């Protein structure tokens with residue numbers, strides 16, 4: 037028993053991290069097969085970032101200007117192309133440590149692991165949720181750009197995120213591996229509004245089920261609610277409206293614990309309206325939303 | 341910016357995980373050089389666990405009874421020895437993925453990463469603190485035994501923990517890699533008191549410094565305190581007494597932020613006495629103690 041904010045084992049992704057330098061800028065790249073993926077802003081100077089014309093900036097660059105280093109060996113760049121906000125550097129050598137992989141665009145509310153890197157070297161790994169407003173609350177310093185987010189289903193790594201920037205508000209923005217930003221963001225040093233964020237209701241409910249499985253039950257009450265009634269409370273507390281699709285995804289946890297989804301919604305309703313009264317749930321003094329129902333089942337069943 | 345409960349990249353440890361089976365029991369082993377380390381209770385049946393005589397149980401076992409499997413290949417066992425609560429299985433092949441490593445006994449209050457495994461396969465990675473009472477609050481199911489805790493300083497993995505058991509209270513107990521339990525615990529299915537736990541004061545202060553560095557400053561006040569005054573509050577709130585050694589370790593963070601350690605102690609004192617008033621610090625509604633001062637400096641400086 038016990039419940040932790042667990043990240044995927046990062047080994048398969050560590051073997052793909054490289055350092056990419058263009059001019060005076062160094063960031064991280066992802067080497068998969070004979071292609072290295074990195075944020076296109078590697079071609080900019082901090083000065084260019086105010087309003088970069090990436091097409092014009094990239095035209096001044098040649099294959100030999102992109103220095104790609106994997107550990108201590110240099111990779112020979114034989115092609116370069118920009119796809120949305122990422123650069124794809126074709127190298128002459130396929131990465132021998134390339135795992136089975138996929139590029140996926142995750143949905144808001146879904147979770148993933150981030151392998152934070154600097155100069156192509158891994159520094160740490162943590163579990164994130166893509167916020168409903170398409171930002172992530174990460175831990176990223178200068179040079180972390182190009183660090184990736186991913187999920188792993190047995191031997192296949194699904195890469196879902198590449199880090200590009202920190203907004204003036206301190207939250208993080210990035211792209212899928214085709215270079216499409218999650219959210220309205222642009223790779224430019226300008227003030228950018230991230231939308232109103234909300235709490236991922238289905239994840240809080242999944243985490244309440246994890247609490248019951250792992251022994252924390254003080255919050256269970258004698259009440260029930262309806263999707264309509266619960267959603268009036270979710271509206272007031274800036275929670276995502278619960279749908280039947282969310283109730284359906286909670287099915288396995290509801291079956292495991294014997295607690296009907298709407299009964300768990302009534303516990304959540306009372307927690308929203310009354311707070312925790314100085315108590316904790318799974319070591320937390322707030323309602324946690326960075327665990328999906330799939331994460332709870334996975335962690336509680338020991339999937340490797 | 342941003343501050344996360346970051347684990348070390350687990351790759352170097354993933355390459356050392358093996359499955360060890362003896363009779364009907366399967367757990368995880370750590371393969372380093374030509375030795376596989378695992379909890380000695382792999383030789384027990386669930387029935388033997390009430391009061392096992394490990395010496396007698398091990399005498400009925402031969403090298404061929406220990407099935408060690410690394411991925412899909414079988415390792416040939418040529419020796420077996422029990423050292424405290426661990427078994428050391430000498431194999432005929434050195435692990436080709438053996439990283440530079442050390443076995444270290446960490447101190448209470450120090451942190452480490454756990455690579456949770458089942459059947460020799462990694463399931464996830466999370467960052468833990470060894471509690472002052474020598475337990476850890478992990479996420480471990482049946483078969484997780486033998487999963488290890490570790491730290492990494494550039495290319496050297498310092499293994500500090502091997503998981504053995506879950507106490508009736510749901511907290512976890514284990515040994516260093518020489519098989520010596522952290523705490524008063526015995527590898528036997530009996531009720532075992534874990535001592536009164538306390539909050540790791542120096543870690544809460546380190547985390548408050550991390551909060552200031554990363555923008556959360558609402559808790560800073562116009563007050564100061566003394567080690568004596570602060571310790572009277574620490575006593576009342578079940579916090580570890582702060583010493584000059586702890587103040588000394590906080591030196592770099594104090595220098596970085598310009599906030600004297602005793603001024604940060606006065607902020608902590610007011611937070612203990614008044615609570616958070618429904619506010620958060622680094623996304624938490626409680627005082628976090630699972631980040632050491634070294635962790636804060638490391639994360640805030642991007643050490644890889």
Ligand SMILES: O=C(Nc1nncn1C1CC1)[C@@H]1CCOc2ccc(Cl)cc21
Nearest residue numbers: 085176177178200201202223224225341
């Ligand atoms: O955001 C960026 N860096 C960043 N992203 N995660 C961590 N960090 C560092 C600041 C802490 C760069 C530098 C700031 O100016 C920009 C502007 C646009 C773009 Cl795409 C990137 C950048």
Ligand SMILES: O=C(Nc1nncn1C1CC1)[C@@H]1CCOc2ccc(Cl)cc21
Nearest residue numbers: 037389480481482504505506527528529
């Ligand atoms: O504790 C153990 N298992 C455990 N440790 N982390 C997770 N888990 C499973 C229960 C959830 C085993 C089984 C219970 O009985 C004992 C007794 C003594 C020893 Cl050393 C091990 C054990």
